[PDB]
Amino acid sequence: QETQGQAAARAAAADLAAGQDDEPRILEAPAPDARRVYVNDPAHFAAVTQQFVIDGEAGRVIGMIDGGFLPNPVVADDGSFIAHASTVFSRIARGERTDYVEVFDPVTLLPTADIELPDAPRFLVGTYPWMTSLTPDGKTLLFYQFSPAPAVGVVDLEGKAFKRMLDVPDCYHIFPTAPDTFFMHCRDGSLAKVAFGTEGTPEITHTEVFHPEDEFLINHPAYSQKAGRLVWPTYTGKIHQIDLSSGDAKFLPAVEALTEAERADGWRPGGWQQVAYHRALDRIYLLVDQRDEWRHKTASRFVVVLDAKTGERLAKFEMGHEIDSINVSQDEKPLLYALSTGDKTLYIHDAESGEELRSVNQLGHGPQVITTADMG
Amino acid sequence: QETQGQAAARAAAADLAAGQDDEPRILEAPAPDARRVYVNDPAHFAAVTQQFVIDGEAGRVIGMIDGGFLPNPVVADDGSFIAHASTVFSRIARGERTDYVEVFDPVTLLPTADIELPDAPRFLVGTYPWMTSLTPDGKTLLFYQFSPAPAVGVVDLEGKAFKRMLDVPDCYHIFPTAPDTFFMHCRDGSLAKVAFGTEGTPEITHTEVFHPEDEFLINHPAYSQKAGRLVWPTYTGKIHQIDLSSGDAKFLPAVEALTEAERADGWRPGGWQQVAYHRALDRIYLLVDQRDEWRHKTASRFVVVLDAKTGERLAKFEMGHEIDSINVSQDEKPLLYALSTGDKTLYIHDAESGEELRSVNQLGHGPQVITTADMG
Amino acid sequence: ADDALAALGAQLFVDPALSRNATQSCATCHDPARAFTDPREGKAGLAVSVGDDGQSHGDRNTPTLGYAALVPAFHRDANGKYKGGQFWDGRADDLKQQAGQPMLNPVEMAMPDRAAVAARLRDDPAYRTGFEALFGKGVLDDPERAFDAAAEALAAYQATGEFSPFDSKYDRVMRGEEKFTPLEEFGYTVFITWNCRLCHMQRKQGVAERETFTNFEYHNIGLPVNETAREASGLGADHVDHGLLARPGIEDPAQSGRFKVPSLRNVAVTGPYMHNGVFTDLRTAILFYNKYTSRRPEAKINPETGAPWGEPEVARNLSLAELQSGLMLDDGRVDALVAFLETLTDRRYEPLLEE
Amino acid sequence: ADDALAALGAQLFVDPALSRNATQSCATCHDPARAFTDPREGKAGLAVSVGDDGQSHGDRNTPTLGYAALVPAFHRDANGKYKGGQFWDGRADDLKQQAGQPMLNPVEMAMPDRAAVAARLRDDPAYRTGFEALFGKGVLDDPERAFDAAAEALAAYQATGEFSPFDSKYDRVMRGEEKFTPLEEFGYTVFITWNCRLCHMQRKQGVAERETFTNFEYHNIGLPVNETAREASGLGADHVDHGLLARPGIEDPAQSGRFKVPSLRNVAVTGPYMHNGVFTDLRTAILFYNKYTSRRPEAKINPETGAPWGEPEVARNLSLAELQSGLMLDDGRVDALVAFLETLTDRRYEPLLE
Amino acid sequence: TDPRAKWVPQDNDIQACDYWRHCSIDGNICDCSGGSLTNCPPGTKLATASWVASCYNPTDGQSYLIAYRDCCGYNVSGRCPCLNTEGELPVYRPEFANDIIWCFGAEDDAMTYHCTISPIVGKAS
Amino acid sequence: TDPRAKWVPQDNDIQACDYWRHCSIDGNICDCSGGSLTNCPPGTKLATASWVASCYNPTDGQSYLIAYRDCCGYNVSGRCPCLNTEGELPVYRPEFANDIIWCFGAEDDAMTYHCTISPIVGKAS
Numbered sequence A, B: 001q002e003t004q005g006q007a008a009a010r011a012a013a014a015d016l017a018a019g020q021d022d023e024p025r026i027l028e029a030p031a032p033d034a035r036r037v038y039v040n041d042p043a044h045f046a047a048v049t050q051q052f053v054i055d056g057e058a059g060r061v062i063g064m065i066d067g068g069f070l071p072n073p074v075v076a077d078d079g080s081f082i083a084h085a086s087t088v089f090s091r092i093a094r095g096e097r098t099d100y101v102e103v104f105d106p107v108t109l110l111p112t113a114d115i116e117l118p119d120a121p122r123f124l125v126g127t128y129p130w131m132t133s134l135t136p137d138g139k140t141l142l143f144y145q146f147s148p149a150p151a152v153g154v155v156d157l158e159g160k161a162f163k164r165m166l167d168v169p170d171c172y173h174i175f176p177t178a179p180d181t182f183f184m185h186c187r188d189g190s191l192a193k194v195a196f197g198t199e200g201t202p203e204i205t206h207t208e209v210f211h212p213e214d215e216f217l218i219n220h221p222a223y224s225q226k227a228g229r230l231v232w233p234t235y236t237g238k239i240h241q242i243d244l245s246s247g248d249a250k251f252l253p254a255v256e257a258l259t260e261a262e263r264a265d266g267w268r269p270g271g272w273q274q275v276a277y278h279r280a281l282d283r284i285y286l287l288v289d290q291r292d293e294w295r296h297k298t299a300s301r302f303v304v305v306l307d308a309k310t311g312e313r314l315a316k317f318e319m320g321h322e323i324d325s326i327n328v329s330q331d332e333k334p335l336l337y338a339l340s341t342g343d344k345t346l347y348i349h350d351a352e353s354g355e356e357l358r359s360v361n362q363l364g365h366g367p368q369v370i371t372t373a374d375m376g
Numbered sequence C: 001a002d003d004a005l006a007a008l009g010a011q012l013f014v015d016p017a018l019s020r021n022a023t024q025s026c027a028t029c030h031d032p033a034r035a036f037t038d039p040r041e042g043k044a045g046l047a048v049s050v051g052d053d054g055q056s057h058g059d060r061n062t063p064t065l066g067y068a069a070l071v072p073a074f075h076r077d078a079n080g081k082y083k084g085g086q087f088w089d090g091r092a093d094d095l096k097q098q099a100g101q102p103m104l105n106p107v108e109m110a111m112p113d114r115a116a117v118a119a120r121l122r123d124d125p126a127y128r129t130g131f132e133a134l135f136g137k138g139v140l141d142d143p144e145r146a147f148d149a150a151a152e153a154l155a156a157y158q159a160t161g162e163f164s165p166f167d168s169k170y171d172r173v174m175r176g177e178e179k180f181t182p183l184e185e186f187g188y189t190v191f192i193t194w195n196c197r198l199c200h201m202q203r204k205q206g207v208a209e210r211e212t213f214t215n216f217e218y219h220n221i222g223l224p225v226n227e228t229a230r231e232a233s234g235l236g237a238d239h240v241d242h243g244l245l246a247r248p249g250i251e252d253p254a255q256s257g258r259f260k261v262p263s264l265r266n267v268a269v270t271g272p273y274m275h276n277g278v279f280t281d282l283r284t285a286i287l288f289y290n291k292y293t294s295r296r297p298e299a300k301i302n303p304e305t306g307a308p309w310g311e312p313e314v315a316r317n318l319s320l321a322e323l324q325s326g327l328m329l330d331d332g333r334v335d336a337l338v339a340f341l342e343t344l345t346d347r348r349y350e351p352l353l354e355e
Numbered sequence D: 001a002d003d004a005l006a007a008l009g010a011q012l013f014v015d016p017a018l019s020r021n022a023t024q025s026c027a028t029c030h031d032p033a034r035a036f037t038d039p040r041e042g043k044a045g046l047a048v049s050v051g052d053d054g055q056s057h058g059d060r061n062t063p064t065l066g067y068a069a070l071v072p073a074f075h076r077d078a079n080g081k082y083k084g085g086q087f088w089d090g091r092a093d094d095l096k097q098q099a100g101q102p103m104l105n106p107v108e109m110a111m112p113d114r115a116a117v118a119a120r121l122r123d124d125p126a127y128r129t130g131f132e133a134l135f136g137k138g139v140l141d142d143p144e145r146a147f148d149a150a151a152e153a154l155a156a157y158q159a160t161g162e163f164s165p166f167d168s169k170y171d172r173v174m175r176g177e178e179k180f181t182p183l184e185e186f187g188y189t190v191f192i193t194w195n196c197r198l199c200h201m202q203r204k205q206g207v208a209e210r211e212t213f214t215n216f217e218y219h220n221i222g223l224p225v226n227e228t229a230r231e232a233s234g235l236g237a238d239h240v241d242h243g244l245l246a247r248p249g250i251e252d253p254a255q256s257g258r259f260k261v262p263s264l265r266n267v268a269v270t271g272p273y274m275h276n277g278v279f280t281d282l283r284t285a286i287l288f289y290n291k292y293t294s295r296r297p298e299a300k301i302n303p304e305t306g307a308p309w310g311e312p313e314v315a316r317n318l319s320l321a322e323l324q325s326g327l328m329l330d331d332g333r334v335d336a337l338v339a340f341l342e343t344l345t346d347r348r349y350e351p352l353l354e
Numbered sequence E, F: 001t002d003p004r005a006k007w008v009p010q011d012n013d014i015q016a017c018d019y020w021r022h023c024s025i026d027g028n029i030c031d032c033s034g035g036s037l038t039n040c041p042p043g044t045k046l047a048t049a050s051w052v053a054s055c056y057n058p059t060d061g062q063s064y065l066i067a068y069r070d071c072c073g074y075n076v077s078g079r080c081p082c083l084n085t086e087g088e089l090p091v092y093r094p095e096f097a098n099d100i101i102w103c104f105g106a107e108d109d110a111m112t113y114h115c116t117i118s119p120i121v122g123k124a125s
């Protein structure tokens, strides 16, 4: 029941009465752990943005990172570092554009690399986690370019240098599977496998087509790199699962997050990060609500939980808030994170019972992106 | 009763039905007039900020200007141009600092000068209009420096070049009176007259002390350059008037904005821009309310109007909102502008009756500073 | 009156008697079997047309007369933009002012003067009846009156439904009579979201009653000289086609190298393309625009030659703001645009889409 | 007991028998009439003190003994900052380890050895009585025991209320017994809000029970050589005072040129200033800190000489983070600081303030 | 007011998020920062690129293609924010995708988002 | 809640604007962005300059000098914003003025405002 502000008031008062001295200094953030959560605030397209580093267990802000225009956050699954690809201009939002990658120490939050990307190659878009991605070894950052044509930028984080742009087909997103390989989703309904090198045309192979042109795959699929599991909902809550663990695409049976009766009654997924995936539990979490078919970006008030193997529903949680994005911690007894862009508040739930445990408010102007590390 | 959005919908429906074409283009703002009003948003210390250019008569946003960290706006009284001294950093709020002056065309809003200020000389502070000031001819901008010591920078707008820093005594604010002369307010209770040639040490003269040490003069006095009138209220609402028109400071009879009975009942000025001065009417406007003596920066719900020459109260308005800043248009039948930082809204009143006429909402994050050109 | 004026025009249109050696009519170069364009092969292929002397080649590609009736008379709008007129350089105010020019041009129909044209019209009993019924007795006896009347009839004929039927698949789709294929619909969507719509749509905004896929403006898109056409024309290696600047009255050097935006209707069947017929294939015309946007090396290369596109004939006043769109057309979108532009073919020319 | 030991130290303090030629005692250089500092004019003015031989001058200024008993024993804290001890360079662990060094220092009291000190103590019947009642019979016959015992008595004497009365105007104002004047309050406020308090306050935060206006830390503030004093010292113009690095056991090169933060109590009456007494005036000492903050040409100038201050004796390990505050003290604030520092004068030294 | 309810177009106020032309707008209505329905505010730069939508006009029962062009080179206006997605498709069908900052072709390489205009470019089919 | 009323200090919650040490704070409480009552958040830079005030502590009846120092080099935190002005004086008395960004002395010349700490630096008078 005692709040963090109350506990700290008590502590400060005891220090004063006991005459305890302390040196004003720059704090270190607590060591990265499973229940650390990052919240990014694209701030409804503002020229500058903020990331909030949060201890989900305490529901406390433990640090922040400044960003530019629509930056892409990444978090190393092992917890060794965080990075973003970001964009600034010499006169706030006008003038010379500089695109750059920064790598940060996860406890001091100090930048340890600042890597300029030549010719302003970043894709400026409402933030999609999988438009910038780390290789499993954490040595390479891959970023998407849309203009003048779809391309993937290769950034050597180890050597702290931009390497090259890769010409790709008409395809989107970046799901890395190895130090030299990633997958993309293509207009034609296939996945493209891109195996690349330092120079030379990459080896690009297309899987078979796995969905019709009129099934619409959401901009925020869940991807577990360690499981090689791509969880891709459509507008109707039908879920495509692709097993990439062999290094090649294996198409798993499709599952329906909502029942036929629910669909008949207007139930659809909706929000920003509509889907989460828990690796160890092999569970899928989906933001759903009753909605018109073209209100697919509005907040939802319910989360359905389902077995990835069988498609069997394990739970339907009533969230009690307008939730735009979900994600999970990847430990045992995980937390379900529920982010409200409207409330500017991260609601922290028990993923088993769906009960609201605590919350962190005042998270910028329009927070949308939750990231966690899979350290287990 | 028809709102601008409604009127715009009708016009657009008419164009469509009549088959009228129009080329999508960049609009020009209407010509600067007496009823144009500028509202600056320091954004509660945000690293980037915004200025809103408003048609006061229509209650319409006609343009915007981006700024950096706590910029100082100025507006030439003849309407020929607007300018600010601003501050940017190479990595949002960290890295290499650049202080600069920008001059803008007042109809296209295009920057026509970008003048870098060497050695990061700007005073970074909650925005005070008279910490950066134009000379009456508009060929020179004068900005205040607090660190390492009180100093004043001379920026040549005609040649688009920084010229030099002026060494001054322990004084504050900048009230220009001539192409080569400005006044400051000093800690010792005097005013300082500073006369600067093309080169050399400035000639600095002091007036006699005009207030005691325990009489506190607010951070936002009103200064009419064309009148050479300095209107300076105290924490209690006592108003110092200094005439600077002859080139030298002549101290007018002090006047009380509140009565002794009101003062005993805890009536005190309060807000940000607490005072306004109308030149033609020779009239003073003060934000007042009932408040504790150390709540001097809180919003006020009342404005009192008094004759500057005599000190007789001409009116007392109940504003109807929490008001932080006031200013007036410098034309006949003037508008009284009442800006609310909490509501992010410029409320536009008739200065004669004090009646609310219209409002412009959604003016940033914490708007604080109103500026108007004196064009008559 | 209206039917009759046009009917007279129909006769004049196919009459070789309006050429010096009587080998050539309007319909020789503006062949109704090929969307009113020239199917004949000359020294430069189908790029430029051979006149009545069997030797002289023009320096510009013969354009369709389909939908030319929809173009406003030449003028300068309030935005300072010249609009309308006829010819690639807009040197004719309208259809009527245009019609007489081929008749007197020695590289084309080659009649020495108006009196010569009046003499040929006079020799035909059918014209004596036709002309006098519409214009009065003795019209053909006055060279100026007769020449003017002939132009009038020819202008009126080009304004008939025959020339602008609006019966393309695009038209039927916009009526609700049929639907676009997914490929054509994608092509349409690309057309209206990419830079194409900035020049190849009638209006800046809204919907046109009778769309012909041009805004009637003048732009320099930076095209190279067609070397075999230029050589065949005999105008010289040092010759520059100044486009709009060549119009008498225009002195503004900013108009140099600008040509009238052509209607894209029937484009699929009216190759070769551009004012000098430089590109053979429709796809090549589309790929030319990629040179301004694509970073790939292939974008610098004309696929028909394997060599670079070439230095612009006029390397100034280029419409860079519109051309430098920042987005490259992938092959999928070029495919789509081709499919869309094919829907702009008039129904009667749909069989020509195979060849 | 504790009283007796102190009383013995009181005798030893003013006794010239502890110098080779019996010309000087502790009190000669640490004069109680001048807040336990040296009023005597030598070859370098009051910058350095003359020893027992009448000729030998030191290289360091004689510091006050007032409040020195509040300094903790020498140690390295958890941040790796050295704190405490005695002497400008902290070479002595505490007051006890300090006391014997002046006795045996040839440029000071100049006793040849502990045997000689014991011999002199043995000659005094009141010392035989005094020492033996506290330390046991025969204590003065053992050189080592006698020397250590004498060091103990002097340390105890220095720890009495007389050396640290806490009766300055400052202490009275903190007890609510009176008020600062306007100028004094401004000075106090400037002191706690400007860089001064980062070094001249006991704690980082909170309230000290017995404030002596020093954090006991070691800092190089970049002072130049005192030319005349260095000349008088006889140490040679090639000599470099390395401060804390001179302490046996200190090997860390980052400590070179650092000196112990002095307590500012009685500062108004213990001029000249700094470890080498280079500045005669208190205002000059305050003005030295402007050299790192002010951009005015006058800031590069020592007002006592009219020439540039001079390059640092040791051009490394400068406390630049603390010193480069970004704010220059104007004359009014200098006046204010002087007026505040004057309130740190002990009651008994207030008449000296003129 | 019910965010999940079927969107209902009106043709009576261009500053409201239910204005019919705004059926797939993402960002801010340019009319609210010194632009107009189909023009950019002073100081900003008009993009040439766009995302499209077929929007139903309740005044005339017709469906029109709106090409949503961005006004660029300024920080986001913050006035009249709206997000609608009638027909809006995922990023891999970018001509119908509205998360993309459609600032390509803007003068001076302007790529920051300020506001969006809602011009009609053609009839829907 | 009544903004104009005499400010009432409490000693039970450091994140609230009525906590006694915040009697002349301007900006944001660092405890709300990964700092603490008297420490800066990670990545920011601690200033040496300060505005000052005597704040009455209701618990022990004593008045303490709080030297408000800023944590700098980050954009403003946006969490737990507060503006109090007990004893606060105009800019010409800077030692007591709180509109000023007191980032002077911060490492890396950091001058942007993130948040403010509230350490006791002495007793009042």
Ligand code: HEC
Binding pocket: C013, C018, C024, C025, C026, C027, C028, C029, C030, C049, C050, C051, C052, C058, C060, C061, C062, C063, C064, C065, C068, C085, C086, C087, C088, C089, C095, C098, C099, C100, C102, C103, C107, C108, C109, C154, C260
């Ligand atoms: C020798 C082949 C030839 C003949 C015969 C010919 N033309 Fe042309 N026509 C052309 C060429 C080549 C152009 C483009 C010339 C230019 O732009 O300078 C053209 C352009 C036109 C245009 C302008 C269309 C546009 O989009 O700008 C019209 C109208 C036209 N001709 C009608 C006629 C009529 C009517 C006749 C019969 C009197 C005729 N032409 C005879 C080859 C011919």
Ligand code: HEC
Binding pocket: C194, C195, C196, C197, C198, C199, C200, C218, C219, C220, C221, C223, C259, C260, C261, C262, C263, C264, C267, C270, C272, C273, C274, C275, C276, C282, C285, C286, C289, C319, C322, C323, C337
């Ligand atoms: C800046 C205005 C402008 C833009 C943008 C533009 N065009 Fe053009 N287009 C022209 C002009 C002008 C010509 C004639 C050039 C010449 O011959 O000198 C032309 C010629 C063509 C032709 C040849 C037609 C003929 O009859 O010779 C095709 C096909 C064409 N354009 C299609 C496109 C497509 C598809 C796009 C979008 C990728 C596009 N254009 C972009 C103005 C433009």
Ligand code: HEC
Binding pocket: D013, D018, D024, D025, D026, D027, D028, D029, D030, D049, D050, D051, D052, D058, D060, D061, D062, D063, D064, D065, D068, D085, D086, D087, D088, D089, D095, D098, D099, D100, D102, D103, D107, D108, D109, D154, D260
């Ligand atoms: C010749 C003059 C002279 C005499 C006699 C003298 N001192 Fe000193 N004292 C000094 C000087 C000079 C220093 C500084 C030396 C240094 O730091 O290297 C000093 C330093 C000290 C300190 C360290 C204070 C501090 O703040 O660091 C103490 C304690 C002290 N002396 C006590 C004594 C005692 C006890 C005696 C008698 C045994 C004594 N002194 C005799 C001149 C003298």
Ligand code: HEC
Binding pocket: D194, D195, D196, D197, D198, D199, D200, D218, D219, D220, D221, D223, D259, D260, D261, D262, D263, D264, D267, D270, D272, D273, D274, D275, D276, D282, D285, D286, D289, D319, D322, D323, D337
């Ligand atoms: C970096 C820590 C530090 C800061 C900041 C600092 N000082 Fe000092 N101060 C010292 C040290 C160390 C000495 C001794 C220097 C030496 O002699 O080597 C000293 C010496 C002095 C002396 C001479 C005292 C004596 O006994 O000789 C005065 C007076 C003084 N300081 C006042 C101030 C004032 C006032 C300020 C604020 C403007 C200030 N100091 C800033 C550490 C500091």
Ligand SMILES: [Ca+2]
Binding pocket: C037, C061, C062, C063, C270, C271, C272, C273, C274, C277
């Ligand atoms: Ca052709």
Ligand SMILES: [Ca+2]
Binding pocket: D037, D061, D062, D063, D270, D271, D272, D273, D274, D277
């Ligand atoms: Ca001294």
Ligand code: NA
Binding pocket: C044, C047, C226, C227, C228, C229, C278
């Ligand atoms: Na050719």
Ligand code: NA
Binding pocket: D044, D047, D226, D227, D228, D229, D278
């Ligand atoms: Na000297």
Ligand code: NA
Binding pocket: D245, D246, D247, D248, D249, D250, D251
């Ligand atoms: Na040593």
